[PDB]
Design a protein around this ligand. Structure first.
Ligand code: MG
Ligand code: MG
Ligand code: MG
Ligand code: MG
Ligand code: MG
Ligand code: ZN
Lengths: 107, 124, 242, 96
RNA sequence: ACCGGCGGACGGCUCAGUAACACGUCGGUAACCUACCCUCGGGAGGGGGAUAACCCCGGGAAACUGGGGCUAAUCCCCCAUAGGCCUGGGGUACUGGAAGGUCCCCAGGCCGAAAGGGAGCCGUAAGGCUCCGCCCGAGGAUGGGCCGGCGGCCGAUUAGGUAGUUGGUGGGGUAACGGCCCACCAAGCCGAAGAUCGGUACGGGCCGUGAGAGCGGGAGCCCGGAGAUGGACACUGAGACACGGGUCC
């Protein structure tokens, strides 16, 4: 099956209606790549991405990081420390607006 | 208690106004809106008022009234007390705008000495 | 707009595709909802008064319109707020003149004189296509109008094709496919008003719009969005273009 | 004064013709409306009753003035199209 | 003059509040509403009712307001048909990057339209012929709602903060997604890369100064936000919890 990302689907199936691969969830908007830094809650992960910001006055850079909470389908089940790909969806909770679609490199 | 009575003839659309006081007016105190009472018992030369012959035992029913201060009576409020309520239509309020509601002062059902005007109609 | 829709429009905030003096007065005509969108249309009053110059004041412009002196796509228009847009035909039969509305080289709307015979046809870009009750196909064009076709011809029409419609009868007489070698005219963007032939088409994942490459008469190649390319012929234009 | 016609344009939709002109007059005051109207109707064979002078304008250090006028083929059309004030100012009708 | 229709939610004024998805910018809505306007496809069958204006009598210091009689509509109410919505079982015709979407066939229910009205000519009359109109469906347009990533003040003589708090499961409510609100199960969420708290401020396009790098301001014109003596809360409508509309303290 394809959902517009041109990547491999997960090996097994699930019954979660919030799964973009096997359920009714739809993805549309930005797609990011990051590192998981927390997986304590059920079906929830925190993903961190790093980038550089340029300071015009001092003509130098500084390091900044962005943290995003994402839904974790059972068919994927990412853990702490591995690279993941996330996509934007409709609001799912107070703070969750993304879903994990692929694990790129297991820890 | 002095009552100013407005008697309406439904069969012609003509109304007459007379003033009633004394023991006769004391009889009328206590009645609500929507009850009949023979005119002969009250005591009135009805045929002289309208200049027309009338059938015997004709009676009238109380339709409305206004107190000495100018506030009207509302059929759906029990008792003789005076209240101030929020209204959207009906007697005692003329809307003038779609959906408008306003707070107005009104009287009740029962007749009391404060009432001055009493509107009644003949029932043949 | 604290509590409801806006009804006014300042001169300084007018759309940038009009030919208008932005500091002469305070207000401008807010266009009525209609065929095209805001960015590709202009109210009829400005055509009557400022472009052609048949009237000096707005009051005498309205008197002309109410007498039915102006035809847009072969239909009498009396509303001075009516929007007139790309590929429309403006006809004055009493003077016997006809114009087509086209974007400029810098993105402004201009009137291009055309012949009387060409004034009877209008090109429409197929913007969308759907199924409708009774199992029929409805075509939605770029100017908001609609058409119905039977289930038998469902394979003769696709999005981005162009249909040459005879107005005001609204009768189809030609279909121009979108493919390599077709002749196109650009309507928006940096390369607006350039024309040429299609060379290549590219696509992208996750809903990004697709891009086309066009070769002009001099042999130069340039890219633009697919939805900004308007098909006007097989290998030569079917209508007069500036 | 010398009157020179710059442009004459036909307007079938309204039913009138529009006339632009210049007046050369060194050492003289700005011409009056009556004189200009008489000169124009003499020059182009126009009925004076359906001719209106929109404006006569003078400039800072010029010896000439610019004028704009209109001519209608029907009196009723002129009454229906033109504003009331311009007809009073040109003496065509009488103010109340 | 009155009944009736549309408008009065725009325009105009000010910067108190607000350190926040308020504002700037790029994207999303396959999670939503929209009277007036444009195109295409259809419809307008049968009944019923009151009341203002007007006449008789009035009440009240006034603001206001009562009873009886009589009448019309593009006013109001019914019946039918069309149509709309929910759920279960099949078929695969459309758009799209991708169907809880659209289309076709059965089945159980609930909701449920309309004004052939007005004007002018030819009509002896019959009836046409134009002009303005009424209702339903599909799409657009216009005006908005909601969501995300990134960007822009000062204080450590403010170091720990949070307990519907963070997430899950099952529902309710909304035009619509959502701890928005409930019932139950877990212990999460933020923080020395400055949380929490305190101070001061409407944001931007821009404006003043300087060779430039910078430093300072953001009343007047445009775009966005908020308010109508302070604090709460509703009716009508497509749109308001409404500056020249309503209720309480
Ligand atoms: Mg307002
Ligand atoms: Mg302040
Ligand atoms: Mg019904
Ligand atoms: Mg500031
Ligand atoms: Mg000021
Ligand atoms: Zn799954």
């Amino acid at each position: 099956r394809d959902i517009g990302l041109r990547i491999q689907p997960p090996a097994e199936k699930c019954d979660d209606p919030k799964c973009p691969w096997h359920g009714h969830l739809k993805i549309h908007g930005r797609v990011f790549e990051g590192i998981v830094v927390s997986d304590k809650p059920r079906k929830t992960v925190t993903v961190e991405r790093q980038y550089y910001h340029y300071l015009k006055k001092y003509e130098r850079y500084e390091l900044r990081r962005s943290r995003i909470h994402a839904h974790n389908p059972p068919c994927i089940n990412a853990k702490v420390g591995d690279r993941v790909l996330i996509a934007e969806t409709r609001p799912l909770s107070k703070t969750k607006h993304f879903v994990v679609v692929a694990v790129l490199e297991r820890a | 208690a002095t009552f100013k009575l407005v008697i309406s003839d439904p069969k012609t659309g003509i109304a007459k106004q007379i003033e009633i006081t004394g023991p006769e007016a004391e009889k009328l105190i206590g009645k609500r809106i929507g009850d009949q009472i023979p005119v002969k018992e009250l005591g009135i030369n009805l045929n002289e008022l309208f200049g027309k012959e009338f059938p015997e035992d004709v009676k009238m029913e109380i339709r409305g009234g206004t107190d000495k201060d100018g506030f009207p009576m509302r059929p759906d409020i029990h008792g003789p007390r005076r209240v101030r309520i929020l209204l959207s239509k009906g007697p005692g309020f003329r809307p003038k705008e779609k959906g408008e509601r306003r707070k107005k002062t009104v009287r009740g059902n029962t007749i009391s000495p404060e009432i001055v005007q009493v509107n009644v109609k003949l029932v043949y | 707009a604290r509590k409801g829709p806006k009804r006014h429009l300042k001169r300084l905030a007018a759309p940038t595709s009009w030919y208008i003096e932005r500091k002469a007065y305070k207000w401008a005509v807010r266009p009525r909802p209609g065929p095209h969108n805001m960015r590709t249309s202009i109210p009829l009053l400005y055509i009557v008064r400022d472009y052609l110059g048949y009237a000096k004041t707005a009051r005498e412009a309205r008197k002309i319109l109410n007498e039915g002196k102006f035809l847009v796509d072969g239909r009498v228009r009396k509303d001075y707020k009516f929007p007139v847009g790309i590929m429309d035909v403006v006809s004055i039969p009493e003077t016997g003149e006809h114009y087509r509305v086209l974007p400029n080289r810098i993105g402004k709307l201009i009137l291009h004189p055309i012949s009387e015979e060409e004034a009877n046809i209008k090109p429409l870009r197929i913007r969308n296509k759907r199924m409708v009750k009774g199992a029929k196909i409805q075509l939605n064009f770029h100017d908001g109008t609609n058409h119905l076709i039977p289930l038998s011809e469902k394979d003769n029409y696709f999005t981005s094709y162009t249909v040459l419609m005879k107005v005001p009868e609204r009768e189809i007489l030609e279909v121009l496919p979108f493919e390599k070698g077709a002749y196109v005219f650009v309507t928006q963007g940096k390369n607006v008003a350039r024309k040429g032939r299609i060379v290549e088409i590219k696509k992208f994942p996750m809903g990004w719009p697709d891009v086309v490459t066009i070769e002009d008469e001099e042999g130069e190649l340039f890219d633009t969005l697919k939805e900004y390319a308007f098909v006007v012929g097989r290998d030569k234009p079917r209508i007069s273009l500036p | 004064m010398e009157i020179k016609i710059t442009e004459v344009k036909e307007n079938k939709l309204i039913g009138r013709k529009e006339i632009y002109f210049e007046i050369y007059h060194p050492g003289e005051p700005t011409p009056s409306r009556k004189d200009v109207k008489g000169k124009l109707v003499a020059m182009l064979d126009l009925n004076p009753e359906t001719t209106v002078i929109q404006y006569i304008r003078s400039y800072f250090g010029s010896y000439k003035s610019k004028g704009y006028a209109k001519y209608y083929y029907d009196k009723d059309r002129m009454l229906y199209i033109e504003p009331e004030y311009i007809l009073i100012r040109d003496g065509i009708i009488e103010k109340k």
